[PDB]
Amino acid sequence: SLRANDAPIVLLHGFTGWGREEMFGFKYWGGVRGDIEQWLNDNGYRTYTLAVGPLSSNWDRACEAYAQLVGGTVDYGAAHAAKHGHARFGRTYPGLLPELKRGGRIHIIAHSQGGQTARMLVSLLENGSQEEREYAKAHNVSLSPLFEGGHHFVLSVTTIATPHDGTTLVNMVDFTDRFFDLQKAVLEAAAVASNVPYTSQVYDFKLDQWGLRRQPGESFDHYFERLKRSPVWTSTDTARYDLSVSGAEKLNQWVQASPNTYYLSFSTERTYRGALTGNHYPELGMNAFSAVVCAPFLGSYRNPTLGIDDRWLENDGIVNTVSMNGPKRGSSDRIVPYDGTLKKGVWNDMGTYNVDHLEIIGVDPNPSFDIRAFYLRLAEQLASLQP
Numbered sequence: 001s002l003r004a005n006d007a008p009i010v011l012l013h014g015f016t017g018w019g020r021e022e023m024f025g026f027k028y029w030g031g032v033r034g035d036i037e038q039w040l041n042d043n044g045y046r047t048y049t050l051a052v053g054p055l056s057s058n059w060d061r062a063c064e065a066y067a068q069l070v071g072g073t074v075d076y077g078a079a080h081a082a083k084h085g086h087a088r089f090g091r092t093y094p095g096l097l098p099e100l101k102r103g104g105r106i107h108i109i110a111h112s113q114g115g116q117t118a119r120m121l122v123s124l125l126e127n128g129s130q131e132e133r134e135y136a137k138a139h140n141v142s143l144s145p146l147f148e149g150g151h152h153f154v155l156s157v158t159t160i161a162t163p164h165d166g167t168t169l170v171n172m173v174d175f176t177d178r179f180f181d182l183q184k185a186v187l188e189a190a191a192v193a194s195n196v197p198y199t200s201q202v203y204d205f206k207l208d209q210w211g212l213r214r215q216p217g218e219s220f221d222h223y224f225e226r227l228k229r230s231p232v233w234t235s236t237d238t239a240r241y242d243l244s245v246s247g248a249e250k251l252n253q254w255v256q257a258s259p260n261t262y263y264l265s266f267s268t269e270r271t272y273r274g275a276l277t278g279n280h281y282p283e284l285g286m287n288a289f290s291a292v293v294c295a296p297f298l299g300s301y302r303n304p305t306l307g308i309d310d311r312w313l314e315n316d317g318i319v320n321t322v323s324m325n326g327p328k329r330g331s332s333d334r335i336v337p338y339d340g341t342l343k344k345g346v347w348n349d350m351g352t353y354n355v356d357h358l359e360i361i362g363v364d365p366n367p368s369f370d371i372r373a374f375y376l377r378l379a380e381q382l383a384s385l386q387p
């Protein structure tokens with residue numbers, strides 16, 4: 001399909017994720033398969049990568065993404081900061097694409113919770129925050145342009161394995177310990193140990209607002225024990241909260257689709273249905289961590305109070321497949337099956353792929369998944385979108 005726009009692509013990770021210089025160069029986008037950003041750039045599709053707080057709230061991450069894109073000091077909003085008890089200002093970025101302030105636009109390709117963050121960035125650009133606007137007026141403090149509303153620079157948002165309606169994983173017994181074991185498993189995939197006090201940061205959680213950071217002589221094991229008991233794990237202003245079924249619905253109540261943006265969703269599944277009661281089990285090849293620690297629960301957990309039934313059992317090892325095609329719980333967004341023509345202001349359900357949560361970004365191997373072809377095909381589709 002002929003190119004219709006020249007907007008660059010911007011990659012955005014989920015509740016794990018790090019910059020290109022982090023993890024000694026092992027890429028979140030590509031993992032053991034390679035470097036996805038490089039493949040796209042080498043094929044004529046200008047691509048950049050964002051790195052935001054993996055455990056931080058989608059709100060915090062959207063503010064971080066904004067500053068990283070246009071340049072400047074991250075501003076979480078005076079009202080938000082005061083309400084949750086963290087710094088109003090975060091780190092300062094040079095800006096990957098300052099041209100966005102003069103008419104330039106982008107295509108955001110997001111994985112996992114990155115999909116929620118991308119949606120929220122669009123919502124904030126379009127409508128800003130009334131609470132922040134009122135607070136700035138009443139307290140005589142500055143206001144970030146992000147909260148003014150009336151802005152637009154995202155041509156499309158593509159989500160891959162995103163928990164738009166949350167994931168029941170959060171309801172597991174011992175979630176807390178298993179979630180950080182997942183972080184350790186991803187570190188191991190990148191050939192990084194969790195019992196070594198590395199002097200270089202290696203994996204920066206970017207918790208400047210909370211005043212948290214791995215200390216000199218501190219291992220990831222020790223650091224994660226502290227994070228478990230910190231506000232980034234115990235507050236409502238967290239990825240943890242937004243990841244839950246309840247929290248995702250809350251997010252859906254205000255984060256809606258913009259009529260000026262194309263939305264694409266890719267779903268993932270890596271399970272088979274059993275013959276006993278219809279529960280779902282991990283297929284051969286699923287990354288070891290998910291197969292042993294998460295999939296069994298995801299494919300068997302039901303919760304009447306939450307409306308979690310049979311349709312929620314199929315999963316990709318981390319997120320329930322039904323949650324991925326687009327926001328539905330507490331959402332007025334429209335979702336339509338891809339019909340050959342991508343449409344604006346609605347979710348274009350691109351289908352379900354037989355790849356697990358980590359395989360889809362290359363962090364876990366899967367020879368049968370042509371990952372390079374998948375992303376190049378996507379880049380071409382995005383480039384074909386009419387502005």
Ligand SMILES: [Ca+2]
Nearest residue numbers: 285286287365
């Ligand atoms: Ca695999």
Ligand SMILES: [Cl-]
Nearest residue numbers: 211212213214
């Ligand atoms: Cl600290």
Ligand code: NA
Nearest residue numbers: 014015016112
């Ligand atoms: Na994830």
Ligand SMILES: [Zn+2]
Nearest residue numbers: 057060084237
């Ligand atoms: Zn916050």
